Design a protein around this ligand. Structure first.
Ligand SMILES: [Cs+]
Ligand SMILES: [Mg+2]
Length: 407
DNA sequence: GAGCGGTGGTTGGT
DNA sequence: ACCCACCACCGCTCA
């Protein structure tokens, strides 16, 4: 669920992470904060094959991507109300990211962080998060189009734009379409009533009128239900396309308790949100010797090769992350810039081509582990890094480069 | 989760 | 007793 929702609210805007991240960093003068439901991995991560722990491995590579976007993730886990939590939590930590346990459903807790200002956006499996208070929700972190390769884009959904848009659906309206047409907890709903007639009741306000009703008031329900049931068997207001005389409404319906599960979901306590306001983001500091230990054991990246490869794979990410904390000791991170580009894979975010020493940047020496065309972690390597990030961490190397081009 | 073609049911009109 | 378009529901397919 919700089956067929995107025909009503639109498919979302397909934008890249880079652009969302650098735009935010430009307007708000600090990195984008993202609550990531941990359910997105389950059925996207188990397609890698070979080696040791391919599921954990793609998680590893996506975390290195999150570093290179300069994004501050908080990773959210379902509570009591394939990829292993323990592992995963340990790797979230080695990367200097944050792991958060929801009291109840992760989707609900995410939306709640966003609406409390702990994060600026939710990245989820779908837009269920909108029924839960979400305003800016992402889905489908994935390669762009048929270009089969790097996962660079997400699909962005904007609750305020949807509610104003052709479908008019808002949080209270969708919730009504979930009750009748089916959701996670009540996959049935009103039998025989699907998305098209449910969206027609939502734009007739029936979703507002019910989310405003307490469950105690029993008198108010019947007036609402009898009213709704009457427009259904008659279509007196023209609320719908046709008339549904045989569309049976169950006695239980509406199930307020299931309704309340959306309108007042089990989310963290106020004290938890307070703790979060002060502890997130934390000191984003990647544990280098920790990742080394992890990768040797988890991925069988053993001895010098493994060390080399961990250096190559993590150095561009560590450069971005170092830039956003930070005579000319800018050189400790960047040796030079060679070129500029506004590539479509970032919706044309300006990038500069930075030269750097991988092994020096990471801090590992491969000669201190056993030795058993090639990549030399002491030669310069070259990454494309967003300009806006370079001007914050290495301002004078950008200026020098900028003067070189004028000349 | 989401798309897609099929199937069977409801409505309004032939 | 038929069509007709629309819809809702099913089963499969890809992750
Ligand atoms: Cs239904
Ligand atoms: Mg869901």
């Amino acid at each position: 669920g919700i089956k067929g929702i995107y025909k009503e609210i639109g498919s979302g805007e397909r934008i890249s992470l880079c652009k969302l991240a650098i735009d935010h960093l430009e307007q708000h003068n600090r990195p984008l904060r993202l609550a990531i439901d941990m359910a997105i991995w389950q059925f996207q991560i188990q397609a890698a094959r070979g080696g040791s722990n391919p599921a954990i491995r793609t998680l590893f590579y996506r975390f290195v991507r999150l570093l290179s976007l300069g994004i501050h993730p908080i990773f959210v886990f379902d509570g009591p109300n394939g990829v292993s939590t323990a592992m995963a939590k340990r790797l979230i930590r080695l990367f200097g990211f944050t792991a958060h346990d929801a009291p109840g459903e992760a989707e609900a807790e995410c939306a709640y962080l966003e609406q409390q200002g702990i994060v600026d956006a939710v990245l989820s499996e779908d837009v269920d998060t909108i029924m839960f208070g979400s305003r800016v929700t992402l889905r489908d972190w994935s390669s762009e189009g048929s270009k089969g390769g790097p996962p660079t884009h997400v699909t962005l959904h904007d609750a305020k734009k949807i509610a104003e848009g052709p479908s008019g659906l808002d949080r209270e309206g969708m919730v009504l379409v979930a009750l009748m047409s089916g959701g996670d907890y009540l996959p049935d709903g009103i039998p025989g009533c699907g998305i098209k007639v449910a969206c027609q009741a939502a734009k007739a306000g029936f979703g507002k009128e019910l989310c405003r009703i307490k469950r105690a008031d029993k008198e108010a329900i019947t007036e609402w239900k009898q009213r709704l049931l009457h427009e259904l068997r008659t279509n007196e207001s023209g609320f719908f396309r046709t008339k549904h005389k045989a569309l049976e409404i169950p006695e239980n319906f509406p199930n307020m308790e299931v309704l309340r599960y959306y309108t007042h979901p089990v989310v963290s306590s106020p004290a938890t949100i307070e703790r979060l306001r002060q502890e997130f983001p934390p000191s984003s500091t990647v544990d280098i010797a920790g990742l080394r230990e992890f990768t040797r054991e988890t991925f069988d990246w053993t001895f010098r090769p493994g060390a080399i490869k961990l250096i190559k794979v993590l150095a561009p990410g560590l450069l971005v992350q170092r830039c956003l904390d930070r005579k000319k000791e800018e050189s400790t991170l960047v040796k030079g810039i060679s070129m500029r580009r506004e590539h479509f894979s970032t919706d044309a975010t300006p990038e500069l081509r930075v030269s750097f020493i991988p092994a020096e940047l990471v801090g590992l020496d491969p000669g201190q582990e056993p030795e058993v065309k090639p990549f030399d972690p002491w030669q310069p390597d070259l990454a494309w890094v967003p300009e806006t990030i370079l001007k914050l961490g290495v301002p004078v190397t950008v200026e020098d480069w900028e003067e070189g081009q004028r000349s």
